[PDB]
Write a protein that binds this ligand. Structure first.
Ligand SMILES: [Zn+2]
Lengths: 165, 86, 74, 162, 68, 82, 79, 410, 76, 85
RNA sequence: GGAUUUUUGGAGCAGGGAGCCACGCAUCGACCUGGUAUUGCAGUACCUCCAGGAACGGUGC
């Protein structure tokens, strides 16, 4: 639900860094809240949390390693649930790290599935090579990479994306 | 006795000069024991009372609308206009 | 110690010299005659102390309770 | 769908990410931007992103307006009354927009309070010496494409297009 | 004799501006009928003064930085 | 006992009122309330370092008024007697 | 809930050092040991002192009965 | 950007703004005749319309009906004329277009908003027929531009001015009838022998506000006319004119003093006498001239306000209350008009029962309440519940019984 | 009083409160008291130096409250 | 009221009203009004007759009032001493 | 009905010189120039250090 952005410079102020993160995430959509603590435990770490996970996945796909205040900010899915996103919103294995389902139309190939799972930094196995070319199974070694991959591929028509839980 | 000193300015344009030096002129439609006047379409001026100024007849005039000025912060009162027809 | 009110302390300070310091920095130090129900003080033969220096004695000065900031026996 | 006073009143008014009042007119696809006077300067930000506005003009008087987020739109031009209409506008995010001409960003040079510039994924920034031209035209702009401008960058930008 | 409506800012971080150009920020634990607010671990802005009690005469305004 | 009755008994009497801010209004007081809210008719009011303005009526509150100087012909002995 | 009057009564029972800022006066504040208080929140300070915010100096005042109108914000002190 | 196509669209919008006003004039040409009769008293060079056609509300042959409404139509026409001149001033100062049209050609959408919108937003918002104003002036109302006493440029509010004059005189001897007689002078009467002095601080402070309110009321009454041109003409007439002339007193100065001759009257402004008056009382004399020009422009409106004040003074209490109610109804209206008891006891009818499913409908007797479960609007109640009309849905009379519907067990 | 009764109905609308210290806080008031004490949520506060900030929740008591500016619909 | 004023801190103003003695009451506007009080109140409100108000702006001045119904708000310190005699 | 949110006030006092521009004191707090430090999942009065500049801002006098 939030795009956690890291590897940023700590020389920027908290309000200026939150405004820069909001201006970077404003291309993907409106931002609900911004978390930017300039303490030594989280120096250089700031993120924007939205009510919808799709805008956060689009922001994590767009502004990963882009030039933001002199440093390449690597943006992925949030490992922790945001206090604003959870309040806007309102199964322990779900969402699992392996998305294995059917109905993968519009020329879904093994190389296309590998290029889609390359956005996930911890992807392990990709199996999309059937006779009907419908069932695809992408398994990742990291939960936060597979969550960002599912948020990026959520809406690629619709197609079925079922976690292996 | 009659207690008409607060009701004579009821629904009439009165200019209450506050203790900070500013004066709000407006249609005070309410009277109370604390002499708190709520002025409808009030105009606030802080420099001086505008009485035929040849140099600048409109200076620091702010339209506050329905602004309720309490009687604790008031310094003086004056008659600046009649009751509005609207 | 024992529970003593500030009104009882101001009543026990009567018959002894106390200084009523106002909000403007000046104080009147004299013998308080009596205390009122609203903690009002009247010091007889009070001497005025302004900015740490004595000014003069004005006699029996009845200081207002809201105007006087503090009352301290000395 | 063209913007109107009823749409401005039905737009959401809440706190932004930097604790600012905003008017959420985003996702409207309005071909002409107008009816900005109904807010009565109660919103410091105007979010009209992902719209179909071609020329950035028609804005009404707003003394308390500070941000104008019009990113992911088809904004290929900017009006000449930018300094007269939004002199207190500090941020104007036009990321992934239709900004191509260098003269289209010439109207953003007159905004003296403008400091944040986010014009990424656009053809105006892809031109030759585009950042130097933007720094030369807008010396008051501190952030351009999420990058700070220094005195060495100002001395480098003062040579070309002087 | 009515009490001040500080139930939303109770057990929450709020900063109240006092007289003399000072501010006290802390967690409010209660209030009084004369708007006397007790803030535990208040900070005078800086340095903290611990548990403080502010009278309602100098209490001008209070703004909460948390959820109220 | 109280000066509020002596202020309220000074109707249709010419006196001066110096405010707490320093404004001086001289004129005939038409009526005063119990909380020293005196309404004066045809009272000329002058602020500090400014020209005076003539008004038909002027209401002065008791908190913002510093001192009410009554006239020498005002019956203060009759006003103090209850 | 703990009231400010209850906290002042607990401080007067403990006889510890408490400092109260002066209303409309940021230069000087009162401090001392509370022995008791009245119904109008006027605390009686034993061995009172005038703590300076800028000068950082204390002037001896003794037993001072300060009215509650001059109190702006009262807290405890270790010294 | 296509500048020639933008200029063609601006010319089409100007033609549509002319045609939309032509359709409004053909629908009600009485407003144009009233505006021409109002502008004939201001500008004399313009030609006048036909008197019989303006009386019958006709342009050539067709007589239009009577249409608050005239003020709203004048404000909408002024807004349309401000929009037309702005679009005129905007435009006053091929192969590549055809090749770029093929990009993103696979779009299932309709594009028919090129030139029809300018006519649709200017045609005299409403669904079919709810307002005579267009979409640009759909929120326009005369309540924020006129007071209750004026009633959409039909009268004037002089009671506040009379009370301000009484407060300036610092007495209670001023009545309602004397103020309208005293203000009737405001060409040299109000400068030399007026009701109040020319340089009084109490009188002039109310007089400047009264002149500004009279100019605002005249602008609200002639918003369809050229207000800026009328202000420029009134300034040019005062700049050209020496206007106040006498047989023996010659020319007076608005100083409040006369001159022996016109040679002395021109040289008096270069001395220290008239120059201090012109430097310290230019705004007061300009406000007096604007108040006199507004009173001359709306002297029929001032006479109507005086007649209404005289009718309210000479009427009774009930007649004045009825006149105030009629004025309020005119001001706050739209522009365009549009058995025994043993049966009651021994049948259960003494106790009434309501069913929550049928919109909480109350029926007498338990028989009708249990006969709700086979009904028509109560069947719409189960349709709103989402449970099908079954015996289990019939057995419950509450809304919470829909959680045990067909999509609960199988 | 009449003003104490009229001030309590100002909750839920966009109104401003000007304090005696010069702070003007304009926003949607959650509730208002009879002694000119108002609590607002999602408001903008302007200082005497021209600085404007945004507050998620504010509460201005009547001890240092100078005036309250409400909408023109409550005047009629 | 009367029993509090005769014996408490208002006893100086009560004795001045009883013996027609001049008292110097300092006002809050940097002035001091010296004169006899014709009456007294609970809130130290006195109607002063022949009150001379001396204010320092420090230049000594004087303003004389034959009658002055002074409000009890501005009264800060009222020094009662042998000034009439 | 002189004890904090309304009326018996915690308010008074000090703002000018020099040549169309700059200022007397203390305190707190954003900041500009370069080097360096953190690769960290946080809901926050406020948070890296060294070096220079401050014609920077608010408060009382
Ligand atoms: Zn039923």
């Amino acid at each position: 639900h939030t795009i956690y952005i890291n590897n940023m410079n700590d020389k920027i102020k908290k309000e200026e860094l939150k405004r820069s993160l909001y201006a970077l995430f404003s291309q993907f959509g409106h931002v609900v809240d911004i978390v930017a603590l300039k303490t030594m435990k989280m120096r250089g770490q700031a993120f924007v949390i939205f009510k919808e996970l799709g805008s956060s996945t689009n922001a994590l796909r767009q502004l990963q390693g882009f030039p933001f205040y002199g440093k390449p900010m690597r943006i992925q899915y949030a490992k922790t649930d945001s206090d604003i996103i959870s309040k806007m919103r309102g199964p322990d294995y779900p969402p699992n790290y392996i998305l294995f389902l059917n109905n993968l139309p519009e020329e879904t190939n093994e190389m296309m599935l590998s290029m889609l799972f390359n956005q996930f930094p911890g992807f392990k196995e990709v199996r999309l090579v059937p006779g009907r070319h419908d069932i695809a199974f992408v398994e990742f070694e990291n939960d936060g990479q597979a969550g960002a991959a599912r948020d990026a591929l959520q809406g690629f028509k619709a197609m079925k994306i079922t976690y292996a839980k | 006795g009659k207690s008409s000193k607060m009701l004579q300015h009821i629904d009439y344009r009165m200019r209450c000069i506050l203790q900070d030096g500013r004066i709000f002129i407006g249609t005070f439609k309410a009277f109370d024991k604390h002499m708190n006047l709520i002025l409808c379409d009030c105009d606030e001026f802080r420099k001086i009372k505008p009485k035929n100024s040849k140099q600048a007849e409109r200076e620091e005039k702010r339209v506050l609308g329905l602004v309720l000025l309490r009687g604790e912060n008031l310094v003086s009162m004056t008659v600046e206009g009649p009751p509005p027809k609207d | 110690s024992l529970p003593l009110n500030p009104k009882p302390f101001l009543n026990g300070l009567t018959g002894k010299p106390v200084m009523v310091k106002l909000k403007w920095g000046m104080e009147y130090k004299g013998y308080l005659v009596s205390v009122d129900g609203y903690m009002n003080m009247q010091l007889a033969n009070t001497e005025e102390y302004i900015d740490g220096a004595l000014s003069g004695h004005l006699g029996e000065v009845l200081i207002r309770c809201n105007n006087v900031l503090y009352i301290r026996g000395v | 769908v063209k913007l109107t006073a009823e749409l401005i009143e039905q737009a959401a008014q809440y706190t932004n990410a930097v604790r600012d009042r905003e008017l959420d007119l985003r996702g409207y696809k309005i071909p002409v931007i107008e009816n900005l006077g109904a807010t009565l300067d109660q919103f410091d930000a105007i979010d009209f992103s992902d719209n179909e506005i071609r020329k950035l003009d028609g804005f009404p008087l707003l003394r308390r307006l500070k941000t104008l987020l019009v990113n992911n739109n088809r904004i290929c031009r900017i009006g000449e009354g930018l300094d007269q209409a939004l002199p207190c506008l500090t941020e104007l995010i036009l990321t992934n927009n239709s900004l191509v001409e260098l003269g289209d960003l010439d109207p953003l040079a007159s905004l003296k309070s403008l400091t944040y510039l986010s014009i990424l994924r656009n053809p105006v920034t892809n031109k030759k010496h585009y950042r130097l031209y933007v720094i030369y035209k807008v010396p008051q702009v501190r952030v351009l494409d999420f990058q700070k401008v220094k005195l060495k960058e100002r001395q480098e930008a003062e040579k070309m297009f002087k | 004799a009515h009490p001040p409506e500080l139930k939303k800012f109770m057990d929450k971080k709020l900063s109240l501006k006092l007289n003399g150009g000072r501010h006290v920020q802390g967690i409010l634990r209660g209030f009084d009928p004369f708007m006397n607010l007790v803030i535990d671990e208040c900070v005078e802005m800086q340095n903290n003064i611990g548990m403080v009690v502010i009278r309602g005469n100098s209490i001008i305004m209070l703004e909460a930085l948390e959820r109220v | 006992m109280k000066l509020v009755r002596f202020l309220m008994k000074l109707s249709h009497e010419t006196v001066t009122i110096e405010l707490k801010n320093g404004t001086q209004v001289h004129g005939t007081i038409t009526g005063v309330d119990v909380s020293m809210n005196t309404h004066l008719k045809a009272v000329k009011m002058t602020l500090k370092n400014r020209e005076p303005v003539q008004l038909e009526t002027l209401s002065i509150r008791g908190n913002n008024i510093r001192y009410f100087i009554l006239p020498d012909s005002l019956p203060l002995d009759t006003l103090l007697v209850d | 809930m703990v009231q400010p009057i209850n906290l002042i009564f607990r401080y007067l029972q403990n006889r510890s050092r408490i400092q109260v800022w002066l209303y409309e006066q940021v230069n000087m504040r009162i401090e001392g040991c509370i022995i008791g208080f009245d119904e109008y929140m006027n605390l009686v300070l034993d061995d009172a002192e005038e703590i300076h915010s800028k000068t950082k100096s204390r002037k001896q005042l003794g037993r001072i009965m300060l009215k509650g109108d001059n109190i702006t914000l009262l807290q405890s002190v270790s010294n | 950007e296509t500048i020639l196509e933008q200029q063609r669209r601006y010319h089409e919008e100007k033609e549509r703004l002319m045609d939309v006003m032509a359709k409004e004039m053909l629908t009600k040409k009485s407003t144009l005749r009233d505006q021409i009769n109002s502008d004939h008293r201001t500008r004399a060079m313009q030609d006048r319309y036909m008197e019989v056609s303006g009386n019958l509300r006709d342009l050539y042959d067709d007589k239009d009906g009577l249409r608050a409404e005239f003020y709203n139509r004048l404000k909408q026409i002024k807004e349309f004329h401000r929009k037309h001149p702005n679009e005129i001033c905007v435009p006053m100062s091929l192969k590549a277009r055809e090749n770029p049209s093929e990009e993103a050609q696979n779009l299932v959408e309709f594009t028919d908003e090129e030139g029809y919108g300018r006519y649709l937003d200017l045609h005299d918002y409403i669904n079919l027929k709810a307002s005579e104003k267009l979409d640009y002036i759909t929120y326009l109302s005369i309540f924020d531009q006129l007071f209750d006493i004026p009633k959409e440029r039909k009268n004037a509010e002089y009671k506040r001015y009379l009370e301000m004059l009484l407060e300036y005189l610092q007495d209670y001897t001023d009545r309602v009838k004397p103020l309208q007689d005293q203000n009737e002078l405001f060409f040299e009467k109000k400068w030399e022998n007026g009701t109040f002095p020319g340089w009084p601080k109490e009188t002039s402070s109310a007089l400047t506000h009264a002149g500004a309110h009279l100019d605002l009321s005249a602008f609200s009454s002639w918003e369809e006319l050229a207000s800026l041109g009328l202000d420029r003409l009134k300034s040019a007439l005062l700049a050209l004119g020496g206007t106040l002339e006498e047989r023996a007193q010659r020319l007076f100065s608005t100083k409040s003093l006369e001159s022996l001759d016109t040679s002395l009257f021109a040289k008096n402004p270069k001395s220290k006498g008239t120059k201090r008056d012109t430097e310290r009382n230019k705004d007061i004399a300009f406000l007096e001239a604007q108040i006199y020009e507004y009173v001359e422009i709306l002297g029929e409106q001032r006479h109507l306000t005086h007649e209404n004040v005289q009718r309210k003074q000479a009427r009774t209490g009930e007649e004045r209350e009825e006149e105030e109610e009629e004025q309020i109804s005119e001001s706050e209206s739209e522009d365009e008009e549009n058995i025994p008891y043993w049966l009651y006891k021994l049948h259960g009818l003494n106790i009434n029962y309501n069913c929550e499913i049928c919109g909480n409908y109350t029926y007498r007797g338990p028989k009708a309440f249990q006969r709700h479960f086979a009904e028509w609007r109560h069947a719409h109640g189960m349709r709103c519940l989402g449970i099908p009309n079954t015996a289990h849905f019939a057995n419950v009379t509450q809304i919470e019984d829909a959680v045990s519907l067909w999509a609960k067990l199988k | 009083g009449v003003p104490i009764k009229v001030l309590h109905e100002a909750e839920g609308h966009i109104v401003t409160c000007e304090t005696n210290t010069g702070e003007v806080y304009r926003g949607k008031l959650i509730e208002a008291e009879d002694n000119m004490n108002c609590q607002m949520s999602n408001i903008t506060v302007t200082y005497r130096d021209g600085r404007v900030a945004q507050l998620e929740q504010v509460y201005i008591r009547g001890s240092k409250i100078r005036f309250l500016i409400l909408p023109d619909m409550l005047k009629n | 009221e009367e029993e509090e004023f005769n014996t408490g801190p208002l006893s100086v103003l009560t004795q001045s009203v009883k013996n027609n003695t001049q008292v110097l009451i300092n006002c809050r506007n940097n002035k001091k009004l010296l004169g006899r009080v014709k009456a007294f109140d609970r809130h130290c409100n006195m109607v002063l007759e022949n009150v001379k108000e001396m204010w320092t702006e420090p230049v000594n001045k004087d303003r004389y009032i034959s009658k002055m119904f002074l409000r009890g708000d501005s009264v800060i310190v009222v020094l009662r001493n042998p000034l009439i005699a």
